[PDB]
């Protein structure tokens, strides 16, 4: 059998017995075949519905208990066996099981002792009976329990970011049934940025919270903080969803969606105007975004007809998410909480944003059609259909009840997108996966991302360039090194994926679905320098981390034995020139121009050998994979030599060698040389323009301002005529016009 054999039988008996009671009375016999087809989240709901009509069947109840046993849910599995046993006493083997499971999970309660006594009298002196007697004894005493707790706490003091240890603390709390403390630590720990990124931790967070909701202690205590803990569950669901989609398989991700949607439906009823309501807002968006990402995962593997229909469906999901407004940040109790919530908002808009675009670039105003066709409530049922099995009740599912009203159907603006990215760099703890994804998403756009601003958001007060550039010791790491690094990581990643699909769209993959986009070497470096800078390294591992960083420094700076293809160096050079040439301050201009000249000075010897059609000495285990896809050709050499000579002149100008800079700039009639010529002619005029000074000099001073006007006009004249020149502008067109207005009013 398969999935089709069992889900096709749905229509077989659906067409033979359609009333709800007989439809639910077939649930056990529906569930009979899903247990065989390895479907346990589905088989569970099928049997559970038959139990809703046939609540007195000992077979069905046991079958669910045996299914909860495969799910390892002891509390749920035990209860199921109990019902089957109390209905039918002749089920001896279940009395053993109950006694067997009660002693394995927790002995603190006498209920485990009681069921063991009965199990003994049903199986006099069987081999298992003693085994259970020894198991019950095993559990430690009060002093023993306190002993374990102190170890974990003393261990958590110095290792608060350890996923496993914090999990054990929740398990120890749960073993003493002081669940309020379990969630309390769970809540105070959802502020930890590292734990929030741990799949296994978030899974523990989801359980310990649900257990508390149903726990007797939650009701007795009070109903005031009930909302507070409820917020964390939704947050946990969002994080858990992001992680499950990336690592886990198609089946597990879909299953998590149902728990998410159940929570949303159970939460919306309360409403209000507090943190919980605001959280529901932002989490609502995440749901669709992840649901869209989830949709695209299935279609990727599937056929083309399903792909378009699914991508169509996903486009709507991402759209719904993007539309959701920025959550009300002021409305939260604390600074940490509100900053977190906003961070996630930026992540939602950024991820969904790029996806919305990459899907809309496929066709012309493709977005408009998506809304005009599927914004209809018919789409809501087509979405629930593709995502879920229709058998589940469509009433308590948030997806089926949401009011999809007035979808903006407006593609995102790049400027808004940039500030979403920059604000969400810390969303996924700055994993090189996160940034390499963003960097690639911007690789197809006409506006470039503010990488230098990303790094400032991550490593604060890390100097742009280190004074002690002579050595490669990693105490001298600089935001330039990182900026130079990410550029290669993305330039490398793009080429690798380009090669992959050629053998077999690359932009269209969502962030969770795609696999590692960087080499484990690169990832190891970023994780090292990150742990080092943020001061979350290990005294023992300090020396190792430190050396791991040191190894790659000499390559990021193009020093001895750099594994750098000439194309990647050139890309670094120009990418830094234009990055620096647009900066306002001199400090930053100088630095970025300096590095750009540096890399240029390293390439030109290679280009000259390449200019005469010779061979480059290939590298030894390079840090940035070489590719013949972008190997430099003679057709482009003279251009680089020219573009480099500009970068030289620019630095000469910034240092003070104006005479040589102008002499060089004027030699090449380039749009960029105008903006430089103009910018430096304007400065010679403005300073001397109004102080008392020789009249003859004043005339010469005005003469420069006249040249400034002319060069700015040449820029705009050539700019308006041709689009290719508009892209060559070292600064925005409107910025060039802005100066001109002031230049002439002077």
């Amino acid at each position, epitope marked *: 059998r398969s999935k089709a054999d069992v889900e096709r039988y749905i229509a077989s008996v659906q067409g033979s017995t359609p009333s709800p009671r007989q439809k639910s009375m077939k649930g056990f016999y529906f569930a009979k075949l899903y247990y065989e087809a390895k479907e346990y989240d589905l088989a569970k709901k099928y049997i559970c519905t038959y139990i809703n009509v046939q609540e007195r069947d000992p077979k069905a109840h046991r079958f669910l208990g045996l299914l909860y046993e495969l799910e390892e849910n002891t509390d749920k599995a035990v209860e199921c066996y109990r019902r089957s046993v109390e209905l039918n006493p002749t089920q001896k083997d279940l009395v053993l099981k109950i006694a067997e499971l009660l002693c394995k999970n927790d002995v603190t309660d006498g209920r485990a002792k009681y069921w063991l006594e009965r199990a003994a009298k049903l199986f006099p002196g069987s081999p298992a009976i003693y085994k259970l007697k020894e198991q019950l004894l095993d559990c430690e005493g009060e002093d023993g329990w306190n002993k374990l707790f102190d170890l974990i706490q003393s261990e958590l003091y110095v290792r608060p970011d350890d996923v496993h240890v914090n999990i054990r603390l929740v398990e120890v709390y749960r073993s003493t049934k002081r669940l309020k403390d379990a969630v309390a630590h769970c809540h105070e720990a959802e502020r930890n940025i590292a734990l929030r990124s741990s799949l296994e931790w978030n899974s523990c967070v989801v359980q310990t919270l649900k257990e508390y909701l149903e726990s007797l202690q939650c009701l007795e205590s009070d109903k005031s903080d009930w909302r507070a803990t409820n917020t964390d569950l939704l947050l946990a669901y969002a994080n858990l969803m992001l992680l499950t989609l990336s690592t886990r398989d198609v089946q597990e991700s879909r299953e998590l969606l149902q728990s998410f949607d159940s929570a949303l439906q159970s939460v919306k009823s309360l409403g209000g105007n507090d943190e919980l309501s605001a959280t529901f807002l932002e989490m609502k968006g995440h749901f669709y975004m992840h649901a869209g990402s989830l949709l695209l995962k299935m279609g990727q593997h599937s056929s083309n007809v399903q792909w378009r229909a699914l991508s169509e469906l996903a486009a709507l999901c991402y759209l719904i998410a993007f539309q959701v407004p920025r959550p009300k940040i002021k409305l939260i109790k604390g600074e940490a909480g509100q900053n977190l919530l906003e961070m996630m908002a930026c992540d939602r808009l950024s991820q969904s944003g790029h996806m919305l675009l990459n899907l809309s670039r496929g066709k012309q105003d493709f977005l408009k059609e998506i809304v005009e066709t599927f914004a209809n409530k018919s789409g809501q049922s087509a979405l629930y259909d593709a995502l879920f099995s229709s058998q589940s009740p469509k009433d308590t599912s948030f997806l089926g009840s949401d009011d999809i009203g007035n979808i903006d159907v407006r593609e995102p603006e790049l400027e808004d997108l940039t500030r979403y990215d920059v604000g969400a760099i810390r969303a996924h703890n700055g994993s090189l996966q996160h940034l390499t994804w963003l960097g690639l998403q911007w690789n197809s756009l006409p506006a470039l991302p503010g990488i230098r601003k990303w790094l400032k958001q991550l*490593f604060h*007060h890390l100097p742009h360039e280190t004074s002690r550039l002579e050595t490669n010791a990693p105490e001298s790491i600089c935001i330039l090194d990182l900026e130079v690094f990410l550029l290669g990581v993305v330039y490398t990643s793009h080429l690798q994926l380009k090669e992959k699909c050629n053998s077999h769209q690359p932009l269209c993959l969502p962030l969770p679905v795609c696999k590692q986009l960087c080499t484990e070497r690169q990832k190891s470096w970023w994780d090292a320098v990150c742990t*080092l*800078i943020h001061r979350k390294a290990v005294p023992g591992n300090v020396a190792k981390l*430190r050396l791991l960083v040191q190894h790659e420094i000499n390559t990021l700076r193009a020093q001895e034995k750099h594994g750098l293809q000439p194309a990647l160096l050139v890309h670094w050079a120009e990418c830094l020139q234009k990055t620096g040439s647009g900066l306002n301050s001199f400090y930053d201009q100088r630095e970025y121009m300096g590095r750009s000249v540096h890399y240029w000075k390293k390439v030109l010897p290679l280009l000259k050998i390449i200019k005469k059609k010779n061979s480059i000495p290939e590298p030894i285990d390079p840090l940035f994979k070489h590719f013949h896809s972008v190997d430099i050709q003679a057709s482009e050499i003279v251009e680089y030599e020219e573009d480099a000579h500009i970068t030289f002149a620019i630095l000469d100008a910034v240092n003070g060698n104006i005479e040589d800079a102008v002499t060089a700039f004027e030699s090449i009639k380039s749009v960029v040389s105008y903006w430089n010529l103009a910018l430096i002619f304007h400065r010679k005029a403005e300073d001397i323009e109004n102080d008392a000074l020789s009249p003859e000099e004043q005339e010469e001073c005005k003469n420069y301002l006249r040249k400034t006007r002319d060069y700015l006009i040449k820029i705009i004249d050539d700019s308006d005529s041709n689009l290719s020149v508009v892209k060559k502008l070292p600064v925005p067109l409107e910025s060039v016009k802005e100066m001109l207005n002031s230049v002439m009013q002077e």
Partner: antibody
Amino acid sequence: EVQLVESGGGLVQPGGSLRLSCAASGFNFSSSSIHWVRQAPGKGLEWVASIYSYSGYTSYADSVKGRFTISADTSKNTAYLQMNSLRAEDTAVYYCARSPWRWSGVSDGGFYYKALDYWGQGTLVTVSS
Amino acid sequence: DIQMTQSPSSLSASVGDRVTITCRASQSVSSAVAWYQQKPGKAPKLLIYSASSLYSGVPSRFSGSRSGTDFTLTISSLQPEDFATYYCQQSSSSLITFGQGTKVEIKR
């Protein structure tokens, strides 16, 4: 261009709490170990806390163990000395100082710092009801 | 616990003198000792690090030395600006301890 500035001092009642701030500039705060050294009037230097350079494992003198808490923030490029259950004996001038990773060695049984190069101006803390 | 016993507690000398201050480590300690100068009310400044290495910027008349478990600060030719209090400092495993200090008073 390189300096350490202490703040967050002032007087407080016994059994109260304070928080000192050691703001650093000019050296990469990540690779530096941060220390606090108090000095009562007419008395000598007493080491009270330390933070290993690249990770930040704490270590306190038994005279303040469990009451004080020293921390380091990379984003704010500043270290702090949280002080609780302050006693009249804690009345003293509190200095902070760094020891680079070049001078910070980890050994079996604990770590060692060769010396304290950069010191701060020193913020006064008075504890008296 | 390790202890750095500094001697003398208070010293009196005049300009040009060759002055000596000594600190004894109770347990056998490795060469991870330092020396500091603290003028009245101002901050302590580092003179010698790693027992006998001079901190950059310190005058050359300062020199550190060790003999067994006894560390010694030596000023070849005392100057008027060197009339201040001095301290010795050891760094053992996860612990730092200072000597009681030595005041250098002008003799008359």
